[PDB]
Design a binder for this molecule. Structure first.
Ligand code: DGD
Ligand code: DGD
Ligand code: CLA
Ligand code: CLA
Ligand code: CLA
Ligand code: PHO
Ligand code: PL9
Ligand code: LMG
Ligand code: SQD
Ligand code: LHG
Ligand code: OEC
Ligand code: CA
Ligand code: FE2
Lengths: 153, 176, 137, 35, 335, 34, 97, 30, 153, 243
């Protein structure tokens, strides 16, 4: 688990804001468990891959490509002429190891939910109640110490 | 190549909304005011030391008396603005301070943008916008402008990322 | 990385036969295309009706086929709707209507051939850009 | 509402008259020397 | 009574008033009190405004969910365009606050008064025997408010396109402007930033040179400022020592020794630069925009070789394509 | 609304503390004989 | 439960072929000789209970009927969806180049 | 609570304005 | 779109206002879209479509003439939008159509001139008033007016 | 008759024509001659919004409201056939026309209540056996009330039905079940009731006049909140002609 956890953009010190106060937990919440590795596939069995979120972007689109980087599926803005909607592609998601290990999901909404999450790397289970989190990334001590000393200097 | 640096910062860091950038401009903008305002106050508050119209020659490169009525200037502004200088030593130190302090602040703001520790959003605003679809401020509006800047630029602006954004994924309003 | 004669060799008629333009015709077309088209067809789109573009494939499925010199040329003389079931020379520049669209008066068969050649050559150079709009700018 | 229009109008006239009849009152005269 | 009106005119014009209420003032003082009073109330309690005429109210006041940074007074409706919308033009205030009536009441009174404020900056100078022209320096910042609050709207066909009265609302005006006019690529804006950057620059130059070449008359533990008394005869700094240093920093002939020529430059620069910036906004108000170098440099085959000018276009398209989500129904943005 | 709980006290002390500082001085200056 | 009727429609025939009861008129420009004249008739002539019912539009010249027969494989038909038909969205859904 | 805080500071700056214009230290000559 | 079989009179746009036709603030029928701001435009080509209540749905429905269709098309593609280097269109457009409306050239040139002249006015008027009373060359070192006035302090 | 210029800016353009006090006659129906309505027109006078008792049920009365938008309320140019029925009744069937106008009214509280005042797909009917149209010859029927905002409309955060965002992208790691309702846009479609009761006939020119009363729901805002019940009273004018 520990290893999977480092592979989550929510621990990237480069995400966050100057007035987004507090611990990283007031953001996405207290991490509870690793839901597991998510593998996306489309009707043909082909395995798709979720383009990850570069630290630079506050918000990023859900795009899925195969090994060769060919766009195979995505979540459309204007549906008027969408060619890759998860619906038209029969995208599905399966998990291995973790909370959701061995399970598969096929109802578009649920698949997209997780796809929408894959973007940040390994998908986790947070406790948002306790700290009354808001779901907006905050930076780590590594980040604050760095900001403070670069300024003082 | 610098204008894109500007557009980038708006789009990605929402830099215009940063307290430090604001101070920055308040200083540069406010500094370019002292500059203009003081200059004019001097040229139109001058004593007559010549018989010509072009009063430039009428100046004593070798000190002595004040070349402009500091006393008159004081009364002018004191009656048109309500406040007015009256200590050239301070009026001039102020002129050093304003724009140097401004630029210092604009720097700190960027030293923070290095770590991406930006002043991107107002959480209370976002939360209300989520639950209530009819709440709209000039702020929310802007954030959408950013989304467009990021989505339509990222591709040819960050080549090393081999970005491919299908036409259907590109955020766009109606018709445009 | 250059505009060779190859890039200039485009389909002349429906029966596969081709013609090869010369760097002179090309430039000349490009100039004429600006003189009487860009106004509304800048970059291969169509401002007063964005649904129909100048992409070669679009012209291929047109009716009759307008994806070859012969085709486009006919069109510039007697324009029709995408199904060809209706002549539109009255609201579209053409030779049979130069009285209404003066810019089309000078235009001679030599000129019409160049304009046509340009339309088939551009997408060959620009590619996707030519058809699509601002998305590709 | 039709009233407010009237009032506003009156009010603006006052001041605009006060303004014209002002500079008219030999304004050049008012100043330190030559007049 | 030497004659009431005769007296009135003597008071108004009196140079013994704490604040010089002038002839221009008689118009200024009221218009400015209305603009200010309406604003403050608006900004604090006004309700949502259908700025884009598409029945999609934008609330910009504190009491309706805004904070100082986001809050603003929203521009009159687009349904209204350039039509005059005085309160007496509405079935009710409720209707007037919804179509952004307060905006006009404010911009018009402000622009009116801020002009007289200029007219006054002349008058007092006259009643005091000092040369005019200060008011001409103030013509630049004014000529901007005008460009941003009136020219641009006249040019664009609606007051709804004028700059909003608020922090974020202004950034909106900017970001969109750039998208529709590509201002950063316009000579006039550039001259504008030269004047502003330059101003701040020079403001610092003068400020330091002078302050650094002050004649000692103060203790080691006494504010160096006290070394000056209001109403001095001679100067308080060695303008010859100042020039001596600055002439050596760069080179002699590239340095001022004439305080009058120094101060003219000091005023001339920013004012001239801002004049151009104001003419930029007043010019791009008729759609004569910045340089368009999109797809200029192309290679030997015809391929398009991008320049930074193109990377700028993408960022502009993002703005174009996303501003006013629901306001457009057609292909070209001609408004 | 959904604001920060400490925002109020952060703003209050941010204004009070330094203002109280200046004021303490000004008054002690102001009351210095001669 | 709550669902986006449109994103759901994309999981049916609509989304794979030209829907005679929903798809916007411009969709007909991807096949030879259907656009102007026929697409107007198809759209103008309300919904269809089966693709073939299109062959039944009153007035269709013998040639038009021919063409239609040829492209039927590119058509389908699904319940009329309001979100997609209201607003005259089938003649202009706000998309251009 | 926030509105009150924003208006208060504003109200405080205007008060300052007043005192600054009408209760400055009279500016004395020579 | 009317030719494609759309009923302009009842078409509802994204906002629910009227894709093609809507009403002005005083009740008249005008064109819809951002163009609602120009409902004061009158012109030979467009007038024959206007009724006593503004655009008449019957004339629009069957009296539109070809010369008008091409007039509207011509003018649509020749709006007064362009760049300094004369590239007709919107700032994001591509090079090709070298054009900038004479109306744009004239209007800008004359606003600049008109402006600077207003400065010219202020400047020469300010000089004349000081010249007359006679102090446009400086304050009389000796008789400094301000110095004879009571302190407002 | 008055030209455009003779009306522009008077507000007169948003007023259905009127018949004089004289015209109180009766128009004849051939029952063997098709008839149509060359021009139906509806002008609102009042918009009442039924209130809510809260927890304690005490019935809910419609209340007046201020018109916050302006004189853009009228429906005009309505048209369709006025087929005569076997039992001798008449049913109007609309085809096309400026059959809807987005209206917005405020309330006691200050709440803006937007509605899509319409009569789309009207199907009005009269009494059986109606040889000639006399004063007060009630027309009653239903119409359709489509969603206020159409498929493409995007909320302040970019979310939309036919287009726009999938969720609250401003809160990347927030729980979603709570935001469900505001992220998933729904397109509402409902029925409406209206009754056009004549007051002035004029068999001469075949142009009747009167007053109407219709009820419908207001904007539910892409289904984010409940719609308010609305009642609308005004006047109408119809032009009957053989055709
Ligand atoms: C306080 C003190 C204040 C002092 C103030 C002093 C102010 C002085 C102001 C001076 C001058 C103002 C000049 C305005 C110039 C406008 C030039 C122009 O419209 O020019 C138009 C042309 C055209 O460019 C061409 O435009 C062309 C094409 O247009 C088109 O052509 C195509 C076919 O070729 C198609 O037909 C297409 O559709 C059509 O649009 C092509 O794209 C070309 O490739 C492209 O090169 O300009 C070019 O080439 C331009 C190359 C320009 C470099 C410009 C620099 C400008 C300003 C710099 C200012 C620095 C200031 C520093 C100040 C510091 C302190 C104050
Ligand atoms: C506010 C805005 C005000 C705008 C005023 C605009 C123009 C006033 C122009 C008088 C212009 C004479 C222009 C000219 O003869 O223009 C000639 C050309 C025109 O080029 C031609 O432009 C032509 C076309 O324009 C037009 O032609 C098209 C069809 O071809 C369309 O009709 C279009 O609408 C129309 O405008 C064609 O494209 C040609 O092929 C092309 O060659 O451009 C040029 O000259 C560009 C010159 C640039 C000079 C840059 C100077 C930079 C720095 C100077 C610093 C001085 C500092 C002093 C400091 C002192 C103290 C500090
Ligand atoms: C020197 C570096 C330093 C650093 C890096 C941190 C970092 C952190 N602290 Mg500590 N802290 C420090 C010093 C420091 N602290 C000191 C000296 C104290 C005692 C006074 C505290 C007391 C403290 C508490 C009580 C708490 C923290 C908490 C936290 C974490 C908060 C997360 C956050 O959102 O920050 C927010 C960061 C900011 C708001 C910085 C912005 C400053 C701006 C607003 C103003 C500059 C003002 C000036 C007037 C500007 C212009 C002037 C003009 C003249 C030019 C974070 C890891 C919290 C925690 O541990 O949660 C689990 C918590 O509860 N800290
Ligand atoms: C509206 C007013 C406004 C104002 C007043 C400012 C003001 C400022 N901005 Mg913003 N900005 C704005 C709007 C505004 N901005 C908007 C709308 C955006 C987009 C959202 C931005 C985006 C932005 C960014 C991204 C940045 C700024 C920065 C800055 C500051 C730069 C400091 C400087 O002058 O460079 C200082 C320049 C130097 C030190 C170089 C001097 C070199 C000298 C010694 C020699 C030159 C000599 C040479 C050899 C001579 C030959 C030259 C040759 C070409 C001929 C400054 C305070 C910068 C900043 O924050 O910095 C901390 C920054 O990075 N701004
Ligand atoms: C780090 C270095 C750096 C440098 C050198 C520049 C330089 C420049 N910027 Mg830039 N800028 C920077 C950083 C920098 N910037 C940053 C970080 C930002 C924010 C991201 C910007 C944002 C920005 C904007 C928005 C704009 C500029 C513009 C300009 C030009 C302005 C000219 C002016 O009036 O300046 C003040 C300087 C002077 C008055 C003195 C002139 C100095 C130079 C030109 C000549 C020196 C000559 C020589 C060495 C001495 C004589 C020798 C003798 C023997 C002949 C100038 C070339 C403007 C532009 O594009 O104009 C066309 C503009 O609009 N900049
Ligand atoms: C954008 C930055 C910028 C600002 C904010 C600014 C501001 C100001 N400049 C003034 C003066 C000047 N500025 C000058 C040169 C310059 N000024 C510059 C840049 C700026 N100058 C630059 C770059 C230059 C060099 C060219 C000169 C030469 C002067 C002056 O002579 C003048 C002055 O007197 O300085 C001492 C002041 C005039 C006050 C007045 O008459 O109020 C009138 C109203 C008052 C006081 C209170 C009532 C407020 C009511 C009317 C407001 C209603 C709402 C507004 C209309 C909305 C605007 C607010 C926005 C946030 C939306 C004012 C504080
Ligand atoms: C409830 C409601 C309505 C609330 C709010 C409404 C609202 C919109 C409020 C907006 C305000 C707001 C939030 C602003 C944000 C900006 C802000 C507060 C930033 C603060 C932080 C900041 C910039 C810090 C440092 C940077 C800095 C030094 C800025 C300086 C700015 C500044 C004072 C510029 C000077 C402007 C000016 C008028 C100078 C005049 C100088 C003087 C009077 C000239 C007269 C004069 C000239 C002579 O030459 C001579 C010789 C003499 C003798 C003489 O006298
Ligand atoms: C009716 C009034 C209508 C408008 C009134 C305007 C009031 C202007 C207030 C300026 C007071 C300046 C002052 O007294 O300091 C006075 C001092 C200068 O005072 C100097 O003091 C020196 C010793 O330190 C020496 O004694 C000098 O002789 C003396 O001149 O500071 C200044 O110089 C002020 C210049 C700074 C520019 C003012 C910027 C105004 C911004 C205010 C914040 C706005 C808030 C907006 C909220 C929304
Ligand atoms: C081909 C045709 C082209 C036409 C082009 C027109 C140019 C006209 C320019 C205006 C002339 C100015 C004037 O009369 O003011 C007269 C005064 C008095 O000066 C002075 O003149 C005095 C004499 S008298 O009293 O004025 O008679 C003298 O005693 C004093 O020492 C001396 O400084 O001068 C100024 O302060 C204005 C200076 C202008 C700026 C120039 C500086 C150049 C370098 C710039 C550096 C930055 C680079 C920027 C690059 C873009
Ligand atoms: C597109 C058109 C471009 C227009 C450019 C206009 C440039 C105007 C420059 C004036 C700056 C205004 C600064 C006020 C500053 C001020 O008061 O000093 C004004 C100063 C003259 O001062 P004087 O004491 O000599 O005035 C008395 C007599 O000389 C008669 O004027 O102007 C100049 O040196 C000439 C500049 C013209 C060359 C340009
Ligand atoms: Mn505020 Ca100038 Mn982008 Mn059309 Mn609207
Ligand atoms: Ca209610
Ligand atoms: Fe000075």
């Amino acid at each position: 688990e520990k290893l999977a956890f480092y592979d989550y953009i929510g621990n990237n010190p480069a995400k966050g804001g100057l007035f987004r106060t507090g611990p990283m937990n007031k953001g996405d919440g207290i991490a509870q468990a690793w839901k597991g590795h998510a593998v996306f596939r489309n009707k043909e069995g082909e395995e798709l891959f979720v383009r990850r979120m570069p630290a630079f972007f506050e918000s990023f689109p859900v795009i899925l490509t195969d090994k060769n980087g060919v766009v195979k599926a995505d979540i459309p803005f204007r549906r008027a002429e969408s060619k890759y909607s998860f619906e038209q592609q029969g995208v599905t998601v399966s998990f291995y190891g973790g909370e959701l290990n061995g399970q598969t999901f096929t109802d578009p909404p649920t698949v997209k939910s997780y796809a929408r999450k894959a973007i940040f790397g390994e998908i986790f289970e947070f406790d948002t109640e306790t700290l009354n989190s808001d779901g907006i990334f905050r930076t780590s001590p590594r980040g604050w110490f760095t900001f403070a000393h670069a300024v003082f200097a | 190549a610098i204008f894109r640096f500007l557009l980038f910062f708006q789009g990605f860091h929402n830099w215009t909304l940063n307290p430090f950038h604001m101070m920055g401009v308040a200083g540069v903008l406010g500094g370019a005011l002292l500059c203009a305002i003081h200059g004019a106050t001097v040229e139109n508050t001058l004593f007559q030391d010549g018989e010509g119209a072009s009063t430039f020659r009428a100046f004593n490169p070798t000190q002595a008396e004040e070349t402009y009525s500091m006393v008159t200037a004081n009364r002018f502004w004191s009656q048109i603005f309500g406040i007015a200088f009256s200590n050239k030593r301070w009026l001039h130190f102020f002129m050093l301070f304003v724009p140097v302090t401004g630029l210092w602040m604009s720097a700190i703001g960027v030293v923070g943008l290095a770590l991406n520790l930006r002043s991107y959003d107002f959480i209370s605003q976002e939360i209300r916008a989520a639950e209530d679809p009819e709440f709209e401020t000039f702020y929310t509006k802007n954030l959408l402008l950013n989304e467009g800047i990021r989505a339509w630029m990222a591709p040819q602006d960050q080549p090393h990322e081999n970005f491919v954004f299908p036409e259907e994924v590109l955020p766009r309003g109606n018709a445009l | 990385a250059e505009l060779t004669p190859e890039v200039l060799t485009v389909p002349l008629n429906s029966e596969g036969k081709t013609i090869t333009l010369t760097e002179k015709q090309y430039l000349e077309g490009k100039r004429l295309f600006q003189y009487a088209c860009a106004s509304c067809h800048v970059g291969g789109i169509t401002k007063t009706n964005p649904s129909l573009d100048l992409r070669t494939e679009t012209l291929a499925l047109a009716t009759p086929p307008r994806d070859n010199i012969e085709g486009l040329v006919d069109y510039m003389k007697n324009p029709t709707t995408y199904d060809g079931e209706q002549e539109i020379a009255e609201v579209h520049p053409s030779l049979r209507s130069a009285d209404i669209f003066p810019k089309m008066r000078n235009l001679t068969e030599k000129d019409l051939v160049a304009i046509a050649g340009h339309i088939l050559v551009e997408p060959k150079i620009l590619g996707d850009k030519w058809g699509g709009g601002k998305v590709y700018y | 509402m039709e009233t407010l229009k009237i009032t506003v109008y009156i009010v603006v006239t006052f001041f605009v008259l006060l303004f014209v009849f002002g500079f008219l009152s030999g304004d050049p005269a008012r100043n330190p020397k030559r007049k | 009574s030497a004659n009431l009106w005769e007296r009135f005119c003597n008071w108004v014009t009196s140079t013994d008033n704490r604040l010089y209420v002038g002839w221009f003032g008689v118009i200024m003082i009221p218009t400015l009190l209305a603009a200010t009073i309406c604003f403050v109330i608006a900004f604090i309690a006004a309700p949502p405004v259908d700025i884009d005429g598409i029945r999609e109210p934008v609330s910009g006041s504190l009491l309706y969910g805004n904070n100082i940074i986001t809050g603003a007074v929203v521009p009159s409706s687009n349904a209204i365009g350039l039509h005059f919308y005085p309160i007496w033009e509405a079935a009710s205030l409720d209707e007037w606050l919804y179509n952004g009536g307060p905006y006009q009441l404010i911009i018009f009174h402000f622009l009116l008064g801020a002009s007289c404020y200029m007219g006054r900056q002349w008058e007092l100078s006259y009643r005091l025997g000092m040369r005019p022209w200060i008011c001409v320096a103030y013509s630049a910042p004014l000529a901007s408010a005008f460009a941003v609050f009136l020219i641009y709207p006249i040019g664009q066909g609606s007051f709804s396109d004028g700059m909003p009265l608020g922090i974020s609302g202004t950034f909106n005006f900017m970001i969109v402007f750039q998208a529709e006019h590509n201002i950063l690529m316009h000579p006039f804006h550039q001259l504008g930033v030269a004047g502003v950057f330059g101003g701040a620059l020079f403001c610092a130059m003068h400020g330091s040179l002078v302050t650094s070449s002050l004649i000692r008359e103060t203790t080691e533990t006494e504010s160096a400022n006290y070394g000056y008394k209001f109403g001095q005869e001679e100067e308080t700094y060695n303008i010859v020592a100042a020039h001596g240093y600055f002439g050596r920093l760069i080179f002699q002939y590239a340095s001022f020794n004439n305080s009058r020529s120094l101060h003219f430059f000091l005023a001339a620069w920013p004012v001239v630069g801002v004049w151009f910036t104001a003419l930029g906004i007043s010019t791009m108000a008729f759609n004569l925009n910045g340089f368009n170098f999109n797809h200029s440099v192309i290679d030997a085959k015809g391929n398009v070789i991008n320049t930074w000018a193109d990377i700028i276009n993408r960022a502009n398209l993002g703005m174009e394509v996303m501003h006013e989500r629901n306001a457009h129904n057609f292909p070209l943005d001609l408004a | 609304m959904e604001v920060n709980q400490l925002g109020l006290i952060a703003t209050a002390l941010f204004v009070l503390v330094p203002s109280v500082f200046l004021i303490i001085l000004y008054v002690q200056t102001e009351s210095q004989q001669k | 439960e709550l669902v986006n009727v449109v994103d759901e429609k994309l999981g049916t025939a609509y989304g794979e072929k030209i829907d005679l009861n929903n798809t916007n008129i411009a969709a007909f420009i991807q096949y030879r000789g259907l656009y102007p004249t026929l697409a107007k008739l198809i759209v103008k002539n309300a919904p269809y209970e089966s693709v073939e019912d299109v062959l039944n539009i009153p007035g269709l010249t013998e040639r038009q009927k021919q063409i239609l027969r040829e492209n039927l494989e590119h058509f389908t038909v699904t319940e009329v969806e309001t979100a997609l038909v209201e607003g005259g969205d089938r003649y202009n859904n706000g998309l251009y180049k | 609570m926030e509105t009150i805080t924003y208006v208060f500071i504003f109200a405080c700056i205007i008060a300052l304005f007043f005192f600054a214009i009408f209760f400055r230290e009279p500016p004395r000559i020579t | 779109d009317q030719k494609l079989g759309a009923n302009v009179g009842s078409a509802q746009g994204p906002t629910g206002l009227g894709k093609y036709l809507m009403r002005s603030p005083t009740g008249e029928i005008i064109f819809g879209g951002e163009t609602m701001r120009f409902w004061d435009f009158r012109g030979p080509w467009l007038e024959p479509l206007r009724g006593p209540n503004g655009l008449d749905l019957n004339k629009i429905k069957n009296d539109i003439q070809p010369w008008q269709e091409r007039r509207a098309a011509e003018y649509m593609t020749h709006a007064p939008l362009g760049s300094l280097n004369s590239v007709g269109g919107v700032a994001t457009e591509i090079n090709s159509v070298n054009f900038v409306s004479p109306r744009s050239w004239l209007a800008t040139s004359h606003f600049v001139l008109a402006f600077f002249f207003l400065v010219g006015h202020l400047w020469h008027a300010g000089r004349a008033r000081a010249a007359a009373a006679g102090f446009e060359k400086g304050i009389d070192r000796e008789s400094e007016p301000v110095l004879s006035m009571p302190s407002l302090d | 008759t008055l030209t455009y210029d003779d009306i522009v800016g008077t507000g007169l353009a948003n007023k259905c024509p009127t018949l004089d006090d004289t015209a109180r006659g009766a128009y004849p129906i051939d029952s063997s001659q098709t008839y149509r309505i060359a021009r139906l027109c509806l002008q609102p006078t009042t918009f009442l919004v039924k209130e809510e008792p809260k927890n304690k049920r005490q019935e809910a009365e419609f209340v007046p409201t201020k018109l916050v938008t302006r004189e853009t309320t009228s429906l005009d140019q309505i048209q369709g056939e006025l087929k005569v029925n076997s039992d001798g009744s008449l049913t109007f069937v609309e085809e096309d026309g400026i059959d809807f106008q987005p209206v917005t009214v405020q309330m006691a509280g200050g709440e803006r209540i937007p509605l899509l005042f319409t009569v789309k797909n009207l199907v009005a009917s009269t009494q059986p056996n109606v040889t000639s149209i006399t004063t007060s010859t009630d027309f009653k029927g239903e119409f359709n009330v489509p969603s206020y905002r159409t498929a493409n409309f995007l909320d302040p955060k970019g979310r939309g039905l036919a287009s726009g965002y999938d969720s609250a992208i401003a809160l990347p790691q927030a729980k979603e079940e709570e935001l469900a309702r505001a992220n998933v846009k729904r397109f509402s479609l409902t029925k409406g009731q209206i009754s056009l009761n004549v007051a002035k006939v004029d068999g001469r020119t075949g142009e009747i006049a009167g007053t109407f009363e219709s009820e419908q729901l207001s904007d539910d805002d892409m289904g984010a909140h409940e719609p308010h019940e609305v009642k609308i009273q005004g006047v109408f004018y119809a032009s009957i002609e053989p055709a």
